[PDB]
Amino acid sequence: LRNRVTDRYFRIQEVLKHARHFRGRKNRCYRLAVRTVIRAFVKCTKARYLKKKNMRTLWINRITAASQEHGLKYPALIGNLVKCQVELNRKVLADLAIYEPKTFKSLAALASRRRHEGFAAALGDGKEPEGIFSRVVQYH
Amino acid sequence: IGIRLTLPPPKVVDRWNEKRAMFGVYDNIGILGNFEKHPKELIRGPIWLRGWKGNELQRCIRKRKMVGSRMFADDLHNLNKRIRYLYKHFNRHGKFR
Amino acid sequence: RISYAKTKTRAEVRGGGRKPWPQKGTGRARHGSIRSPLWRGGGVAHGPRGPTSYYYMLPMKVRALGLKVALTVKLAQDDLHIMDSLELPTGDPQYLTELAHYRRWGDSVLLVDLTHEEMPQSIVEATSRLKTFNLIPAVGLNVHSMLKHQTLVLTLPTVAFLEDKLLWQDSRYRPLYPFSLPYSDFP
Amino acid sequence: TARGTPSRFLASVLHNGLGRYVQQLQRLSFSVSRDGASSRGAREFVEREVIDFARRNPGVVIYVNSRPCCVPRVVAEYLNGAVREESIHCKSVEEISTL
Amino acid sequence: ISRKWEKKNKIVYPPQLPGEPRRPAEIYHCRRQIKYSKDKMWYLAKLIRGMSIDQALAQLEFNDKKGAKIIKEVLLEAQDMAVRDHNVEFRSNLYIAESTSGRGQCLKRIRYHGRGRFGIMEKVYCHYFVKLVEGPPPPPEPPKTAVAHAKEYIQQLRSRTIVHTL
Amino acid sequence: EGGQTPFYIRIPKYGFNEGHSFRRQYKPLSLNRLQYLIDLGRVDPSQPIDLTQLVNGRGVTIQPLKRDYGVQLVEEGADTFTAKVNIEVQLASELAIAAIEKNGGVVTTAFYDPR
Amino acid sequence: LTYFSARKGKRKTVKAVIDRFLRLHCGLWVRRKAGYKKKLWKKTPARKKRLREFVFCNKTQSKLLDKMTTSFWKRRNWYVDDPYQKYHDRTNLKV
Amino acid sequence: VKKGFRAAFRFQKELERQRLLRCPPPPVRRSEKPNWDYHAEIQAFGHRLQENFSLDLLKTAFVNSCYIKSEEAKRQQLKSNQELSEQGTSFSQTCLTQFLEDEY
RNA sequence: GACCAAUCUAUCACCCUAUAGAAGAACUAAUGUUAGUAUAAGUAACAUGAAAACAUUCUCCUCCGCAUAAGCCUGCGUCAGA
RNA sequence: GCUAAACCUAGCCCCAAACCCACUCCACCUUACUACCAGCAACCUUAGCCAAACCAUUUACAUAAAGUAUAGGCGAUAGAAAUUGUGGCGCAAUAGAUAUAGUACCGCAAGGGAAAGAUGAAAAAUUAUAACCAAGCAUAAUAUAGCAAGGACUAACCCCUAUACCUUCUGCAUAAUGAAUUAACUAGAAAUAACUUUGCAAGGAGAGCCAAAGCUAAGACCCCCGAAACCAGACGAGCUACCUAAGAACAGCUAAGAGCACACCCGUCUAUGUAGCAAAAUAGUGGGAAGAUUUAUAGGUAGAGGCGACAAACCUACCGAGCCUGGUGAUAGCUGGUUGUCCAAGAUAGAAUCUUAGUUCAACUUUAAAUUUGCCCACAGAACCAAAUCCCCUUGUAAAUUUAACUGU
Ligand SMILES: [Mg+2]
Ligand SMILES: [Mg+2]
Ligand SMILES: [Mg+2]
Ligand SMILES: [Mg+2]
Ligand SMILES: [Mg+2]
Ligand SMILES: [Mg+2]
Ligand SMILES: [Mg+2]
Ligand SMILES: [Mg+2]
Ligand SMILES: [Mg+2]
Ligand SMILES: [Mg+2]
Ligand SMILES: [Mg+2]
Ligand SMILES: [Mg+2]
Ligand SMILES: [Mg+2]
Ligand SMILES: [Mg+2]
Ligand SMILES: [Mg+2]
Ligand SMILES: [Mg+2]
Ligand SMILES: [Mg+2]
Ligand SMILES: [Mg+2]
Ligand SMILES: [Mg+2]
Ligand SMILES: [Mg+2]
Ligand SMILES: [Mg+2]
Ligand SMILES: [Mg+2]
Ligand SMILES: [Mg+2]
Ligand SMILES: [Mg+2]
Ligand SMILES: [Mg+2]
Ligand SMILES: [Mg+2]
Ligand SMILES: [Mg+2]
Ligand SMILES: [Mg+2]
Ligand SMILES: [Mg+2]
Ligand SMILES: [Mg+2]
Ligand SMILES: [Mg+2]
Ligand SMILES: [Mg+2]
Ligand SMILES: [Mg+2]
Ligand SMILES: [Mg+2]
Ligand SMILES: [Mg+2]
Ligand SMILES: [Mg+2]
């Protein structure tokens, strides 16, 4: 032959190194190993958004469970927390609820106070308390 | 397995060989040798071609019309078959037309 | 360069022509003539056919410009050298090698002369027993040999002949017919 | 491909952030080639960048093998014992400096 | 071709010191080219693994199988070599440690079907390896009782940490 | 074109290049070209301006093949022309003939066979 | 079309095009409208006058005719007396 | 016989790596390896911790008694680390006790 | 459009790399071809009449057997090992 | 570790150079390897596939002139002269000649056709290298669940996810074909013309060819396997159909191309067999069995033919006309495939076509370049027998025309 193939086994090894823990011929035969590695890479690249959504849902469920244990709901709690210029993501909320029950208890108390103040305002239109905890701090 | 095991021996190569040290020498004799011999006559190869690029079919027709008078029977038949196949594939089969 | 590789196509291959296992008969893959590129030991589908040749000429002015460029490169690079007569006091390769090493020339000193008939026996014998130094007449000067070697050596007559033959290429009329003809003005 | 690849929890080698800061890089061995077009970048580095790099942090010692090598490599050892033997085959001076 | 089991018998270890164990002597032996299948040889090997040499020979002497006599002769030759060459005093203090049986170099023949066809008839050949280690045989791994299962469950429940957080 | 009458067949025939293999042809020769040649040295006016002199000076490169039987003349450089020399060209017009004669020249015509 | 001949190994020109067309150095192909010599009694004078006039070719048609010809036909035409002498060269053009 | 060479070299390197992975040799001291320095390495180690101290004393602080005995036995065919180590451990214990008493 | 695994050629290299010239220059498939090996699978098919001193005897069947034209060429005798 | 994996040297292709071989001893045209005895032999236009989308006349066997004249269902095409003038940028046992050899094997016949081997200085070295590299197994069998993989997890499973690849077609896991892996072989050769860069310039090229800025030189572009089927001569009546010469067979019983019934000839039916005993077998019921009966031996009838109690049946297992050779690597609007990484632009109104499974033009799309207007645009302008549409300044913008290319729809 003329300048035939002389560097093929290394390609097979590089393709199989990612298949050193599969079942069946997927960890030996190159034909099926190629498709297996391709599918594995595609799924690993597509599962990032799924992982993000799963983590978000898990944090939401944890915060809802903490609120229920403290005596509140997740939507109302989030609304009251947002209605106080106290922006806090869900990860920190879950971490506090897990490793800081007193912090989450104080946060739930503040949320309930804000809820009651908003209800009183909507009922009587203020005049002129405007909620001691309400009244956002203006900026310029 | 397709790949062998033991490496090969040291492929010795004499860069200063008699032909390498004299490769290309005595060429271009026309531009300075008051034009006495064309470089196309320096190459040592076939007799039917010695300074004409051409193509496959053209080279085959050349070899036929220049050596076909003293070629073997089987060789001449194979050359004729090759010429006919090349013609049928070029002047009919292909693309861009 | 003139290639020489030649394969055997499916037609030029010996044997074959029948029809093993008919189409609608056996349940094997459809096949026609044995020795096909899909079989073992058959002919090559596409390959080198006959001895090819990548021959093609270039303008003489392009060659002259290339030679001038090679000369300028060998000169500006502190590699060119001019002499008066390629002679030696004895004619031993050891003496020439020692002189080249002392003068800090290099290893591959390309010596050039003219005529080829006026070569002295001393330098001839000194160069006919080495692998780096080679005696080549001015008539046989190219670019490959100049770029392959390190330094270059020339003499007054060689330089004059080279300059004349490289300047004649400039300021000339059309060839009309091959320059091999006698020509009046041209010698 | 995490299931088929080992993992490790984030941590430090000695909590250098608390007290003093110790350079984790230990030594550097350059295998430059004198005659060879496959180490021009490494040569230019060892010429006009290695001195500045060594003087910018005296807590690291660098060596220069300068042996007949066909592929220039760099051995980056560490205190814990890890070794990162990388290759710098055909690389600009800026790329080698950044690496 | 690849002979190695016969070469393993020439391994040499350095001289042991007084403050060191006895190190049970290992034995290696195998017969090449055996006109027999491989699945039955592996069955016989699995049958003769944890048992000693005496029980192995006793079971082989009453095993209606062609390979039984071959395995018995192989074990007898291995015991003789161990008592003679490898230097071993006790003849019954040897037990089987490893036993396999791989295929050999097979030929090819024709069977001739009832039509214009046929099939390849390979001459299945096999081998037989055995490893006899000095000393008495080890006891069989007893089944884990309920206490072991409870301990494993308690360990698994105690070795669990929070997930997806600090 | 799939089977229909191709475009290059639907057009009828005509005697366009009928006798094209025999129609005499001559390379044009401009008076400005002659003046430029005389000024650049080649084709000196001290000798007859025969076809050999023009071929040597390489002013109008012709070819024996291609049904060419000499060289013709053109009345381009009618003005700013001063050569004064016997010119020999196969064809010539009255305008250029007079333009050359008034300058002291002698216009003539000949016929060169193929060989 | 014959891309490669069987004797010399070169291209071949279709004589039909050479007989039904006319080459010009300017890069255009001249032709003649068909029907200029059949059923002339039923054609109105305007139609007969329009049919007795030459016509040029399109870009694709000109390229096809060129492909069907060789470089030999692209030579000049310094005829002693030809009516198409003032058409081989095109002057006054800006894209 | 494939006309490959670089692929053969890569395969030989892979086989050498596999052999090294098979029977890995014992971990030899880094001092015996080729690329190694003593004075420069000691200076780099001293400058890494960000301070300044004598070099001869630091060198002597690394010489043990068993090492000196082995060197003498080999030569038959540079002080010690007793007082220095004692002072170091005493100072470390005192500092740790003081810190624990001041903070706890 | 930008790169690039393998080879030969001219160039310092020389624990394997660079500049240009060439493609029989780069396989998960063409009921593709060659070589070994899984799959049904140890599944389908299969023979050797009985006792015994291995001398010998017993049970059953037979349209089969004898020599030859056609046809084969040493093809169940001895000697040693399989 | 069983089985395995590599070695490279014998030899092959090209021309470069000469023009080659050929009876020791017997034997060889009769039945070839046969010591021996009365009878004609020779010279033959090659056809055919294929392209014109069929196909009859038609289609090929140093340089320039010139792919010109000329011939041609004047269309697909064919195409002259006078003049001129001693090594491999090769192959290294699936490659190279098929070759260790034209060897068995199919075979009565023409005819087709492969591999043997691997360390070396001593195999008259005992004694083995370093195990490691694919496919099948042992060391080491499985433990809810579901394209065999991911996020993970302190952990294997347990938690959530997602309908194998390629080709076709508007549409896919689809139940449309392809597939058991591994190692080797295996599928884009270039053209008038065009684009980019070198050198000179109204000239260049190492005669010939082109010139109202041109030419030269280089770089870059045109796949494989697959039928039915024809021509000319060999090989084929040892089985089948017919003919020719000389021979053989037909118990017995009842009594004449008579009847039953041995041997014997063929097989109307059942059952088994269906990769079996057999690429056409086993039992009786079946017709004949001194006659149009069967058969041992030899010769003759060969494909546009022979033969034929016509079954258009047979002619060596497949005969609506057996195989081989050389034309045929035939052709083919048709099935299948057409090998490494990454970036960008990238969906078509219709017409013709012995045509709608195919081709061309047009239209869409891509590249380099010169030009200036490209789209919604506002008053208005645009017919007697409803949503609407065309031109359209300022206004948003940056798009549009053309030139030279060429694949793709
Ligand atoms: Mg989200
Ligand atoms: Mg053939
Ligand atoms: Mg072949
Ligand atoms: Mg039609
Ligand atoms: Mg493969
Ligand atoms: Mg299939
Ligand atoms: Mg395949
Ligand atoms: Mg089964
Ligand atoms: Mg029996
Ligand atoms: Mg055809
Ligand atoms: Mg046809
Ligand atoms: Mg002639
Ligand atoms: Mg071969
Ligand atoms: Mg071969
Ligand atoms: Mg394996
Ligand atoms: Mg998976
Ligand atoms: Mg595909
Ligand atoms: Mg397809
Ligand atoms: Mg469709
Ligand atoms: Mg399916
Ligand atoms: Mg121009
Ligand atoms: Mg017969
Ligand atoms: Mg009959
Ligand atoms: Mg019936
Ligand atoms: Mg059946
Ligand atoms: Mg009847
Ligand atoms: Mg009867
Ligand atoms: Mg009777
Ligand atoms: Mg036939
Ligand atoms: Mg064929
Ligand atoms: Mg084909
Ligand atoms: Mg059709
Ligand atoms: Mg299909
Ligand atoms: Mg391929
Ligand atoms: Mg895009
Ligand atoms: Mg029609």
Task: For residues F96 and F72, give the distance between their C-alpha atoms in angstroms, rounded to a whole number.
Answer: 12
Q: Which of A4, A5, A6, A11 to mutate to test the interface with H (most CBs of H within 10 A)?
A: A6
Rounded-to-integer distance, Cα A122 and Cα A46, Å: 47
Q: Are E27 and E82 in contact (CB under 8 A)?
A: yes
- Backbone conformation region of residue B10, classed left if phi is above 0, alpha if psi is from -120 to 50, else beta: beta
Q: Tell me which residues of chain H have a C-beta less than 8 Å from any C-beta of chain D.
A: 35, 37, 40-41, 43-44, 47-50
Taking CA D40 as the corner, what is the angle to CA D39 and CA D42, rounded to the nearest 5 degrees? 65
The reply to whether H75 has its C-beta less than 7 Å from any atom of strand I is no
Q: Which residue has the tokens 């706890």?
A: H104
C161 touches chain B (CB under 8 A): yes
Neighbours of F8 (CB within 10 A): 19
The answer to whether the beta carbon of residue C31 comes closer than 7 angstroms to any atom of strand I is yes
Distance C101 CA to ligand 1 centre (A): 78
Measure B58 CA to J43 C1' (Å). 39
Give me the phi and psi of E95, to 5 degrees please: -130, 155
How many residues can be counted in chain A?
140
Query: Does residue G6 come out as left (phi exceeding 0), alpha (psi in the -120 to 50 range) or beta?
Result: alpha
At C19, is the secondary structure helix, strand, or coil?
coil
Rounded CA-CA distance C77/D46 in Å is 27
**How does strand D73-78 pair with strand F68-71?**
unpaired
DSSP at G79: B
Q: Which of A109, A116, A77, A117 is nearest to A94 (CA)?
A: A77
Which nucleotide comes closest to C39 if you measure CA to C1'?
A: I33
Torsion of Cα atoms, A41 then A43 then A48 then A53, to 10°: -170
Report the neighbours of E using a cutoff of 3 or more CB pairs below 8 angstroms: A
**Does the beta carbon of A14 lie under 8 angstroms from any beta carbon of chain B?**
no
β-strands F106-108, F86-88: how paired?
parallel
List CB contacts of G81: < 8 A, sequence separation 6 or more. Answer: none
Q: Is G31 helix (H, G, I), strand (E, B) or coil?
A: strand
Neighbours of chain C (3+ CB pairs under 8 A): B, F
User: For C53, which DSSP code?
Assistant: B
HSE-CB of D42 using CA atoms within 13 angstroms:
28
Give resolution in angstroms: 3.9
Protein-to-nucleotide distance from the CA of G48 to the C1' of J403, whole angstroms: 35
Q: Which residue has the tokens 């401009």?
A: F30
Subunits touching F (CB < 8 Å, at least 3 pairs)?
Answer: C, G
Query: Is the distance from CB of D18 to CB of A35 less than 8 angstroms?
Result: no
For A4, phi then psi, to 5°, come to -70, -175
CA dist., res. C105 & res. F59, Å (int) = 52
D21, D58, D63: residue with CB nearest H47: D58
Structure tokens at D39: 């180490």
Establish whether the CB of E65 is closer than 7 Å to any nucleic acid atom in strand I: no
Q: Is the dihedral of CA C120, C122, C125, C126 positive or negative?
A: negative
Residue closest to sugar C1' of J407 by CA: B96
Q: DSSP letter at G74?
A: G
**Nearest-CA residue of chain F relative to G60?**
F7
E47 CA → ligand 27 middle, Å: 74
Q: Which experimental method was this entry solved with? A: cryo-EM
Whole-Å CA distances, B32 to B23, B28, B51, C116, E96: 19, 8, 20, 15, 92
Q: Cβ neighbours of residue D54 under 8 Å, at least 6 residues apart? A: D60, D61, D62
Distance CA(C54)–CA(B52), nearest Å, equals 9
Span between the terminal Cα atoms of chain B, in Å: 47
Q: Do A6 and H7 touch (CB under 8 A)?
A: yes
**DSSP 8-state class, residue H26:** P
How far is it between the farthest Cα atoms of chain C?
91
Taking residue E134's Cβ as centre, other Cβ atoms within 10 Å add up to 18
Inter-residue contact A40 to D1 (CB < 8 Å): yes
Q: Where are the domains of chain E?
A: 1-166
| Dihedrals phi, psi of E164, to nearest 5 degrees | 60, 60
**Are C64 and B31 an interchain contact pair (Cβ–Cβ within 8 Å)?**
yes
Q: Is the CB of C44 under 7 A from strand I?
A: yes
The answer to whether E30 and E6 have CB atoms below 8 angstroms apart is yes
Q: Are E127 and E71 in contact (CB under 8 A)?
A: no
d(CA F30, CA F89): 11
Please tell me which of the candidates A4, A5, A10 has its beta carbon nearest to residue H10.
A10
Interior angle at CA F75, CA F71 and CA F80, nearest 5: 120
Structural element, H or E, at residue G71: none
Q: What's the gap in Å between C25 CA and the centre of ligand 29?
A: 18
Extents of the domains making up chain D = 1-99
| Contact status of D1 with chain A (Cβ, < 8 Å) | yes
**J302 C1' – C18 CA distance, angstroms?**
22
Is the pair B, E in contact (3+ CB pairs within 8 Å)?
Answer: no
- Rounded CA-CA distance H89/H85 in Å is 6
3-state secondary structure chain F: CCCCCCHHHHCCCCCCCCCCCCCCEEECCEHHHHHHHHHCCCCCCCCCECHHHHHHHCCCCCCCCCCEEEECCECCCCCCCCCCCEEECCCCCHHHHHHHHCCCCEEECCCCCCC
Q: Tell me if E164 and A58 make a contact (CB, 8 A cut-off).
A: yes
The position carrying tokens 């006899």 is E132
Whole-number Å distance between alpha carbons of C42 and C125: 56
How is chain E classified by DSSP, letter by letter? ----TTGGGG--PPPPPSSS---PPB--EEEEEESS-SHHHHHHHHHSSSSBHHHHHHHHTT--SHHHHHHHHHHHHHHHHHHHTS--S-SSSEEEEEEE--B-----EE---SSS---EE----EEEEEEEEESSPPPP-PPP-HHHHHHHHHHHHHS----S--
Instruction: Provide the 10 A C-beta neighbour count for residue F13.
Output: 11
Ligand closest in space to the Cα of F5 = 4
For the beta sheet containing G29-32, the strands, ordered from the edge strand earlier in sequence to the opposite edge, are G22-23, G29-32, G54-56
Q: What are phi and psi of F81, to 5 degrees?
A: -120, 125
Listed residues: CB within 5 A of ion ligand 4: F 3
Q: Decide if B5 touches H, using CB distance below 8 A.
A: yes
Among residues 101-140 of chain A, which lie with CB inside 8 Å of chain D?
A: none
CB contact under 8 A, B5 and H7: no
Q: What is the residue whose two structure tokens read 């010809």?
A: G69
Judged by CB atoms closer than 8 Å, whether chains meet at A21 and D3 is answered as yes
Give the gyration radius of chain G's Cα atoms: 17
Strand I reaches within 7 A of the C51 CB:
no
Q: How far apart are the first and last CA of chain E?
A: 59
Start-to-end Cα distance in chain D? 26
Q: Within the 144-163 window of chain E, which residues sit less than 8 Å (CB to CB) from chain A?
A: 162
Touching chains, D (3+ CB pairs < 8 A): A, H
Q: How far is the CA of C51 from the C1' of J58 (A)?
A: 36
Three-state DSSP at D75 gives strand
Residue C57 to residue B35, Cβ atoms within 8 A: no
The region, left, alpha or beta by phi > 0 then psi within -120 to 50, assigned to residue E5 is alpha
Distance measured from the CA of protein residue C140 to the C1' of nucleotide J179, in angstroms: 64
- Chain A partners of D2 at a C-beta cutoff of 8 Å? 44
- CA geometry: angle D36, D39, D43, nearest 5 deg: 110
Ligand 7: centre distance to CA A27 (Å): 21
Q: Are B58 and G9 in contact (CB < 8 Å)?
A: yes
Are the C-beta atoms of residues B82 and C12 closer than 8 Å to each other? yes
Q: How far is the CA of E118 from the C1' of I65 (A)?
A: 37
Distance from C-alpha of B87 to C-alpha of C12, rounded to nearest angstrom:
17
F16: region left, alpha or beta (phi > 0 left; psi from -120 to 50 alpha): alpha
3-class SS at C107? coil
Residues 6+ apart with CB under 8 A from B2: A5, A8, A9, H2
Give the rounded distance of the alpha carbon of E62 from its chain centre.
20
Which bin fits H2, alpha (ψ -120 to 50), beta or left (φ > 0)? Answer: beta
Neighbour-count burial of A72, counting CB atoms closer than 10 A to its CB (0-12 exposed, 13-18 middle, 19+ buried): buried
Segments forming the whole domain that contains residue C157: 1-187
Residues 6+ apart with CB under 8 A from G45: none
Measure F2 CA to ligand 4 centroid, in angstroms.
Answer: 8
User: Looking at beta carbons, which residues of chain A come within 8 Å of D4?
Assistant: 18-21
- Indicate the number of domains in chain C: 1
Query: What tokens appear for C120 in the block?
Result: 């002295």
Give me ligand 25 centre to Cα E117, in Å: 18
Query: Contact A77/A55 with Cβ under 8 angstroms?
Result: no
- Is residue A39 classed as helix, strand or coil in its secondary structure? helix
Residue of chain C nearest F62, judged by CA positions: C176
Considering only CA atoms, name the residue closest to the C1' of nucleotide J209. G72
H55 CB inside 7 Å of strand I: no
Nearest to F9 among G16, G37, G75 (CB): G16
Compute φ and ψ for D63, nearest 5 degrees. Answer: -120, 160
